[PDB]
């Protein structure tokens, strides 16, 4: 059965030197928050930027079905914290990375559960 692989197309596009999706909605905040990945209000720490979640979701932004089977979106209606070094491509960041189910930080960008 056929299904479009949007994640693959975007990853391939980026590696090809394509310009990342823009107009992700950056929030003003104190940058003294918890640093968790996806929160109900902006929680950036001094190493992060907080964004409106919908605008950082590849499926929301491209107007396509979410891979969740109920079509739920993990980001819409929440705020996503992005390492300031990756804030040039929030959509790529959220697509490529994973949130630790235990501590709520990004695996490899705040999660310390393996130490």
């Amino acid at each position: 059965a056929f299904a479009v692989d949007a994640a693959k197309a975007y990853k391939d596009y980026l590696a090809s030197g394509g310009q990342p999706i823009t107009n992700c909605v950056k929030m003003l905040c104190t940058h003294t928050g918890t640093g968790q990945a996806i929160t109900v209000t902006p929680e950036a720490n001094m190493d992060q930027e907080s964004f409106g979640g919908a605008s950082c979701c590849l499926y929301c932004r491209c107007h396509i079905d979410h891979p969740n089977p109920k079509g739920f979106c993990d980001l819409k209606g929440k705020y996503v914290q992005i390492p300031t070094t990756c804030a040039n491509d929030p959509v790529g960041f959220t697509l490529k990375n994973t949130v630790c189910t235990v501590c709520g930080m990004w695996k490899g960008y705040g999660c310390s559960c393996d130490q």
């Binding site: 909605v25 003003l28 905040c29 409106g52 919908a54 605008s55 932004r61 107007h63 819409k76 804030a87």
Partner: protein
């Protein structure tokens, strides 16, 4: 002066009391732009300053609060203003937004269509509108009261704004409506607020604070708009992004304001007093249900 550290400037009361004739708006700093913090959109900054100003008023903030946001889409296809409102509002606040054109939103629900097609079963505690048609800005034509979405908004406030609730409705030199100013006299307090990041525009937000459902004051809206423009013409506002750098006290405090269902005959001067103080909301507390009328056509 000291205004540069505020989020913006509210129309001083003395200007509200005048009887000016409408003139053209000529801003000293017209065309100047504020320097925004790195990476921050104009409409995030603008909504942040609005919300910072709204924090200084007597908004009713109940549990199960309901907010509707018209004109929430952008030419970018996202909803920056909705994202700021949802940041500002207490977690759990029901937020619905709408625009003529498709956009992606953080709102709990989004209706796409002309605002006149929007209907809601329930009443609202706060109505925000950023609706605007740039075609209104015709400096070669007389500047008359506009209808269109302003006619909808006046009716929507009178029918679906809970007593005690508040509004902030974007206007400009040419995008304005006389009945909307007249309806400001149906709130306990009102103003026209100019954000400091957009001080070189004739834009303002007409804010109505604590709806009473009846006139506290009879306002001639043609004169009041002339008064607003007179204020803008004689009081340059220094562009400023200073307040954007202090977000420590941004979140709207969940006051848990009381909600009661009351019939019109039960609204005495003691009730009106509580409404006026941001201490009471009158509406039901049932389900929030919305819809948009769709016009059906077969072109075959």
């Amino acid at each position: 002066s000291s205004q540069a550290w505020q989020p913006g400037v509210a129309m001083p009361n003395l200007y509200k009391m005048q009887r000016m004739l409408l003139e053209k708006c000529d801003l000293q700093n017209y065309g100047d732009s504020a320097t925004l913090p790195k990476g921050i959109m104009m409409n995030v900054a603008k909504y942040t300053q609005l919300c910072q100003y709204l924090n200084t008023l007597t908004l009713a903030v109940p549990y199960n609060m309901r907010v509707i946001h018209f004109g929430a889409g952008s030419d970018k296809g996202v909803a920056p203003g909705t994202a700021v409102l949802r940041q500002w509002l207490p977690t759990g606040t029901l937020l619905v937004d709408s625009d003529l054109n498709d956009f992606v939103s953080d709102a709990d629900s989004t209706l796409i269509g002309d605002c006149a097609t929007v209907h809601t079963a329930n009443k609202w505690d706060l109505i925000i509108s950023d609706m605007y048609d740039p075609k209104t800005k015709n400096v070669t034509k007389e500047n008359d009261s506009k209808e269109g979405f302003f006619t909808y908004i006046c009716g929507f406030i009178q029918q679906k704004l809970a007593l005690g609730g508040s509004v902030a409705i974007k206007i400009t030199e040419h995008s304005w409506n006389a009945d909307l100013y007249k309806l400001m006299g149906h709130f306990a307090w009102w103003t026209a607020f100019v954000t400091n990041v957009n001080a070189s525009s004739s834009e303002a937000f007409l804010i109505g604070c604590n709806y009473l459902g009846k006139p506290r004051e009879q306002i001639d809206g043609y004169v009041m708009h002339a008064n607003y423009i007179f204020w803008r013409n004689t009081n340059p506002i220094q562009l400023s992004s200073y307040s954007l750098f202090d977000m420590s006290k941004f979140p709207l405090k969940l006051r848990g304001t009381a909600v009661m269902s009351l019939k019109e005959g039960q609204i005495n001067d003691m009730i009106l007093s509580l409404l006026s103080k941001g201490r009471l909301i009158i509406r039901e507390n049932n389900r929030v249900v919305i819809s948009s009328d769709v016009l059906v056509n077969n072109e075959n």
